[PDB]
Structures are given as C-alpha cells and as structure tokens.
Design a protein around this ligand. Structure first.
Ligand SMILES: [K+]
Ligand SMILES: [K+]
Ligand SMILES: [K+]
Ligand SMILES: [K+]
Ligand SMILES: [K+]
Ligand SMILES: [K+]
Ligand SMILES: [K+]
Ligand SMILES: [K+]
Lengths: 292, 292, 292, 292
C-alpha cells in the first residue's frame, strides 16, 4: 500500500540505544488497530542516519516479523553512494517488504543528471517498487520535477515522498508523470494541503502518536471531504509543528514514551535528550490533539 | 601542521573507480614541490561520501606512505553518527597523520547541544588534534560561533574549517577562542578575504591545480602583503568559481587530468563525468590562471 | 466584484511616458468583452511606483470614465506612510471605485503591530472596502496570517491579495477569518493551486493578454472543475513565468504592444525597454498560449 | 566629506510627529563635540519613508543651518522613480550639502540596466557627489559590483554605502573601481570587518548614541589598529545588534531620548512606539556600552 496515512515509524531503543522489540511490537499493534496504511521502517524518523546497515536490516526484518502480514512494510534504502544504495537494496530482495523509500544522496550534492543516474541504477537492480524521497533541508540537493518526470518512466519507480513543503511541486510533478505515480507528502504541516492539490497520502511523523486521526484525515481527503479533514488537521497542527521543536525524532520519541507506547525515549548521538522546555511544548501539543 | 595553503586532495581513480596509486604519488610529489603546507586526505573533494571506511582508510594510509614525511597529512574523519566518527578516528590513532578534519553531522540536523556532544565525544577518544568543519550547504546544519567557543575549550579541538562563505564568522569565532585556535577558510573564492580578517590559511580545492600560486598567496597574506596576494587571487578567481560549475570534485578532477597530474578523471556515482560545456568553462579558467 | 479573474491592468503610455487614453480604452473594452471580473487600476503592474498621486488619480478616474459602469474598478491606494495612504484613499471617496488595493508599507519594514495600526487607520477613514496586499519580495516585510486575522475583524477590510507564492498561506489565513473574507492570489504561476486550496480568485498580470482564458480558468476553479482549469493553466504557464523574465510590467507591456492592444510599450525609468532575448522568450510564451 | 564615522541621524520629532528643532540642534552639537565625520540627513534612520519631499527638504536645510559649517551634511535623495529622484536632488543643488546618499529604487525591482540608467540620469542632473546605497532587505533589489563598476565611471558617482552585510562585496567592488571610490559600510554589526577588508568608514545607526566611541573606532581602523578598534567594537556589539530589536529607528530614538539627546521618541506610522521588552533590551545594551 502507497496511499493514505503511512507512518515513518520510530526505531524504539532501550537505554543502551539498541532496538527494543517489545516497544516495536506495541507500536506495530497500535498501527494495525488504528488503520495506518503502511509502515516506513528506518526512514529519517527511524534514525536511518545512526544505525549501521546490519542494525538497519535487523530493524526492517523485525518489523516484518512483528507485522506478521497485517500491515505492509516499506524499507528505507537510501544512500549517498549509488553502489551502497544498490547493496542495501539487495539485502531486502525477497524479504517481504512491499517497496523501498530511497532518499536523494545527501552531502555530495549531485547534479540532476547524477540523481537520474543514481535512481535509475538502483531501480535497475531490483524488482521492488521505489519511492523517491526529496528533502533538501537535510541533503543539500533538490530533486526537481523535470527529473522526477524522467525517473517516473522507469517501470519500478512508482512515486515520491516530497518533503520540501513547497506545495507548487504537487502539480508540477503530476503533469509530468502518469496517473498511477504516487505523490506522498513528507511534511506533516502541509500534508493536507498537499493532498487537496492532488497528493495521494502522507508519509507521516505525526502518525506515530495520532494514528487514527491521521488515517481518518487522509481518507476524508481522498474522498474530497477537505473541510471535514481540515477539522482534524486543525487539532493536529500544533503537533505537526512541535514534533520539530527539537530535531526529529527527539520530540516524537518523547511523545511515544509519554503515551506509553515505548519503554524509553533513548536516541543515538548526535541526537540528544529532549529539553524541559521541549517536553512542555510537546505535552501541550498532545493535549491540543486530545491524546493526553 | 595547520596554517598556509592546505590542499583538500582529490582521490584519483582508475577507470573502475578505485584509487590510482601512480596518480596519487604524482599529486603528492607536486604538492611537495609546490610548497603546499599540508594535505587533507579524503575530505569532501576526496570523495569521502562514496568511499567505504575501509577504502577511505586505505587512501589515508597510502597518502601517508607516499608523503614519506615530506608533507603533513590530515585525515577526513567525519560521520553523522557519533559512534561511527569515533570508529573512523580510531583507525588513524598512532598512524602518522597529524590531525583530523571532522565535519558536522550531515542529514540528521542535530541541535547545537548535539554538535557539542558529538565533537566532545570524538575528541575524548583520541589524542589527535581535531579541526571542526562547518559546511551547512552540504549538511543541513550550521555550527555556530558560540558552540565553536564551547568546543575550543576541549584540549585537542584546535581549529575550524569555515566553509560558509560568511566572512563575519572569522571575528565572531576569534573573539570566543584562544589565540592559538586555528581559523581556516573552506571557501576558495573568499579565502583571501578570510585571511585578511584574521584567518590563518585555507583548506583549498583550487590548490589541487594551482598549488604554487596558492601557497605564494597564502605566504603573502600571512606577511600582511594583501595587495600582492590579491593580484594572485584575481588570476585564480575564475578557477575558484568555476571549479564549482558542476559539483565538486567533477571539475577539479577534470582539470587535474587536463594538466597531466592524474591518469583519469573518473569519479563514483552519483558524481557524473563533466559535461562538454563544463570542460570549456574550466579550460578557460585554467587559461586565465596561466596554467594552460 | 472581488472574486474570479481580476486584471492588474497596465497603465499604457505614449513615447513620453504619459497615459494613453486611446490604448486604455482599447484594454478596457477588451476586458469587458472577455469576461474579466474587475480591473485593478494603478497596482504594481500599473506602475504605481512611478506615477505621482495626481497622475495616479487621473489614471483611476480615466479608467472609471472609460469603464462607464460596464466593469468594476478597484484603485491601488497603498503607501509606506500611513498618513499618505489615508490622504490618497480620500481622493477616491465617492469616485465610483468599488474598493481599494492597499499594499503593506515598503522599505521601512514595520513590525506586525505597525501593519495592524497602518491598515486599521486606513480602513477607519473610508467607507470603501479594502483589500490588503502582501508582496514581501518587493516590500521587505511580510504580513503574516495572524495579523491578517486581526485585521479581517475591521468591518471594511474584506480580503487579501496574497503574492508570496507560498501556498500554505491560503488555509492559515482561511482558518482565522470569516467565510466572507476574500482570498485572492497575486502570483499567476501559483494561482490555480491557490484557488484549488480555497482561494476565490486572482489579481492577475497574465489576464492583461489572456483575459478570456483566465476568466474561464477561474470560473472552472470556482466550480470545482480543477482538471479542466488545469488544462488552461498548462497553456498559460509559460506566460505566467515569462511575463517576469524581466521586471514587471516590462514584458506584459511589450506583449500588449505585440498583440495590438496598446500603441506603445513605453514605461517610466527605472523600468527600461525589453531586451531582444526577452522579446523572443515572451513571444514564444504568447504562441504557447495560442495568442499569436 | 566621506571617510570615518558618518552618522545616519535620526529626525527627532515632537509629540505631533514634526521635526523638533531644539532636539536636532542638541544632536548636531553632540556630533560636532564627538568627532563624527559627517551627518547623513533624512537617510533610512532619518525616516525618509514617512516625510514628504517638502518636510524632507526642511529637515535637510535646518540640519545644514544648525551644522553652521562645523560638520558636513549629506542629504538622502533616493526615490524609486528616476524623475522624482532628479527633482529631490535638484532641491539641494547650491544648498551647501556636500553630497547625496541615493538608494536603489525600492518596490519596483529594476534590472541592473535599470539601476545603471537611474543613477546615471540622477548624476547627470547635478554637480553634487553621489553615494549609491544598496540595501536589498529593504528594497527588493541588489546593486551588484559589476554595476557599481559601471557607475563608478560617471564623474560624480564617488562611493557606496553597502548595507548587505555581505563582506565579500568590499573587494569585489574595490577591484572594479578607482582607488578614490569610497566604500562605506551600511551595517554597523559588520562595519569594523568591512573597514578591515579595505572599506573607508561607516554610515552608522549606532553613532547616533555612541558617537565618540564610533569615531575613535573608525580612526583606529584607518590607522591599522584593528585589535584596539575591536575592543571598542565589542563594547558596542550589543547596541549594533539590539538597535534592530524592533524596526529602525524605533530603538535608536528611544535610546536618544533615554540619554537626554532628544525630547521625545515619537515616530511616524507605520513605525510604532518601542515595546516594554524592547526598552529593557536596548537599556541593557546601552549599559554594556558604558553609556548608561
Ligand atoms: K551514518
Ligand atoms: K528492475
Ligand atoms: K514508473
Ligand atoms: K583547544
Ligand atoms: K514613487
Ligand atoms: K470605516
Ligand atoms: K471584515
Ligand atoms: K566617479
């Protein structure tokens, strides 16, 4: 599944920074019960940056095992070296994942042609559906609509997670791709607007703690019921913003702890513990959403 | 050690994308003959993004072996996970390098507290001198002067490569740190200005192909001869700019090949070969500098 | 009328820079025949910057005389001194204009409270409907949704021309104002998207040369027929962009000349004649729109 | 004439918003006693935006009368219509001012060719020396070094007030103009850096309230005594920043009133009175500078 509310799930950790299977189970069960469409395993919110490839693969496999066929899993598989992205992708071939979420190379700032070659090469070497991921604020590059157009002609490049927050991208991309290419927001605060313009869903941070409301908002949006969806979005908007009051996923992990969904809010350096002021801000946003 | 013209050396490759020892030897000999002060091995221009940690270490070690004590070698040791940066640094402990160039975490956009903890932890696991490296256009994060001041209190944090191109940073940082903290430009086009404001040298892309001119410029700067230095700077300014006409190190590799310094201009994906228009632009800049 | 396609009309000039009544007549007749909703007289596109208040008033009065009740006229009345905006507004009281388009103060960068006091004072001293105008790229300030909310409580502040091109503003403003407050795009390239998100129309540059297609696009949008509207927008998109290839209204005045709607393309300094390359670009966009 | 510490003097007002002659006299006497090099009358800090051309001229003439030959006076003469800038400049021909400070057109965002024609036309209608003024945050346009070079060829275009805060501009401009073209900072916080790179002085906001310190800083800079100058700069740095805590000249007027230099801190809308929090911030900065 690549439409609706898709959660970019936290990778819950014990006090030593290792994956907590009991906490992950509790989250997966929460998502299955709350109508979430799919789980993105080891995306940005899942601390792809600080897991090594072996730990990253373990978390994906654990998520698949725990999901037990009840909800589709999409693995984060991006890298800034095209060889490394190919290598990682191969680890998930025949794993049970339904697709891959593959970020534009970060740090090395490739040209558009470089992005086109990168993603084309990755797609060539798997049969799994690829979802492109553009997030210039993190990577230093910006995958532009014209290049997305070129890449959407590759059979298994099936959609994009567009995280610029620049809503003009929706119809710039739509007009260059086929009707079956999936356009997904990667920016919770602008995601309803993104769907109202023609987007098909959201890969969401907020969904980690407001799964049912996100699932209903996206269904209403898909049906055209934008005023109804906006009521929900209004209750969630402080959370959409304040989950970024300190770097993601610091706030959302604390929120998950506060609700009891995970045992600890531990992250890996260079992510640090939430500040007291951030705890107060996040708490207030949770209460506005009706979650506490 | 850490003053004058420091080259961020290319990692020359064969056609297969692996290090070319004969080319590396030719470059290192060139920098020795030219008066380059030190070599940064596997920085940004050295393709740190696309070498694995083993390959990266092999290049550092080969570069030290070839330098043969004639020219000091600083290793790139950055990582966006603190654990990984500690592991990489540890590879070089007792190696012969004279210090490490450690970039702020990329992609995960840590807070200033996170940057402080990251670099403090790395410094605690080594005796080698650490040069911080701030390059927000690539990383998505900006190590601010206040935090540089905080880190400068750690015994073996001894300088910064400041690649914002924001010259106000020179005296902001200088006022918060001791007189022996080293300020180095990471932006060739502004570097002479940077030294004019108080900085101590440059970690340079341009020095790959204009080593003698860069070293002469920097010597003139250190002696307070800015007008003489500026004549050299004006001859090099088109190269300083046009070596970024396409993403670094695509142009500077091509230029090295054109000058006979390396055997091939091969890079690793997602870096792609220079375009015809790029060749013509860089060619013109080399001509303007008197190098061709 | 404050919904649909509203043209920010050129102020056509003879070779001496004085208003050409014959050309203005021809444009007004064109707009009446083409279904344009209203005319904004002496907006940005009408060279408000370079007419003095007397010439500005003359152009508004001439436009009203020529319109002859067949199409509503809205006057540009903004200023960067609140006294001057009040003064100008008074000149149009009982003129026959239906409302005023009042830009945020430019150059002096007032606070939000300063904008609130400015516009509140202007509204206080007229009975005419006021349309706020936010265009940060020109003015150096940005009238934020929270302040728009406060101002919409003033009886005769009835809407906003939102020219940031930042589409998140539509629903940020909508949720703070009553259902009868008019949200109008001031950015042609994003205007259909702006209407799709809840906007009511556009105050348009493109409409000066594509009046019928703009009028139909906005009607289709108002009816919810966005796919049909987008077909039109696709044919117009090169014009939406290339009418800004050189500073507005340089391109649109040349376009109006080329179509025969005005006798000369003259502007006032510091606007200069269109370049040959700009003529070629604009011509190509006109042909894409089917206008030549 | 055009070196050292030049004050962009406030236009002190009574409670009605009209010039206060007794206050203006007190300020001018202060600048004479302090060693200020020249006074810019009705620049940005002087509320050029909210004075009409008659009122503006009255203030310039009163300032010259009060200066009584003791201190040179430069008039603000900018306008965003070329005709209006020529008319304003003509008011001062044969007045006794020593030159004009002429800002790039604001709001209408002319091209570089337009900027060239604007300033060339203004220069042709006067014998007075012209200082260009670039302040893109306020105007929406950026007079680039190449164009400054082109204009510097006009006999009576003799310098620039560079208020970008982009210190690379100093040597970019200096390389394109003659040795006697004057480079002045328009950004107090970077001005000492600006002089360190080659600039000749500053047109300052801070000098309204720290005149003696500013003049001493600038003298030390001209003599090459940067470290001594920097101690003064460090004492003033909070004022350099916090005089923009609210929009200029709201804080600097308040500060003048607090110091007994002016009778009232009144400004014209859309500038509003300083907030309580602003008073506390500016108070603290004045204390840090040793002025209170
Ligand atoms: K990593
Ligand atoms: K395939
Ligand atoms: K496809
Ligand atoms: K230290
Ligand atoms: K004007
Ligand atoms: K009223
Ligand atoms: K109202
Ligand atoms: K000159």
């Amino acid at each position: 599944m690549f439409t609706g509310s898709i959660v970019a799930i936290v990778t819950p950790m014990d006090e030593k920074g290792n994956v907590c299977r009991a906490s992950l189970k509790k989250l997966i069960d929460y998502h299955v019960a709350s109508g979430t469409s799919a789980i993105v395993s080891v995306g940005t919110t899942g601390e792809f940056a600080t897991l090594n490839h072996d730990e990253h693969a373990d978390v994906v496999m654990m998520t698949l095992d725990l999901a037990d066929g009840r909800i589709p899993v999409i693995a984060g598989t991006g890298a800034n070296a095209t060889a490394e992205a190919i290598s990682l992708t191969q680890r998930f071939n025949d794993s049970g994942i339904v697709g891959c979420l593959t970020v534009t190379p970060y740090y090395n700032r490739p040209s558009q042609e470089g992005l086109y070659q990168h993603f084309k090469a990755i797609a060539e070497h798997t049969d799994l559906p690829q979802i492109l991921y553009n997030v210039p604020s993190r990577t230093g590059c910006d995958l532009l609509p014209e290049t997305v157009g070129r890449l959407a002609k590759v059979k298994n490049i099936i959609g994009i997670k567009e995280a610029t927050g620049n809503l003009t991208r929706v119809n710039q991309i739509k007009e260059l791709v086929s009707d079956d290419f999936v356009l997904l927001s990667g920016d919770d605060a602008s995601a309803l607007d993104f769907m109202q313009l023609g987007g098909h869903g959201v890969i969401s941070v907020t969904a980690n703690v407001a799964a049912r409301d996100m699932a209903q908002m996206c269904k209403l949006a898909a049906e055209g019921h934008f005023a109804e969806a906006r009521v929900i979005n209004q209750r969630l908007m402080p959370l959409h913003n304040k989950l970024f009051v300190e770097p993601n996923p610091i706030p959302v992990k604390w929120a998950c702890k506060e609700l009891g969904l995970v045992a600890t809010d531990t992250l890996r350096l260079p992510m640090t513990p939430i500040t007291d002021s951030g705890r107060e801000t996040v708490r207030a946003a949770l209460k506005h959403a009706g979650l506490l």
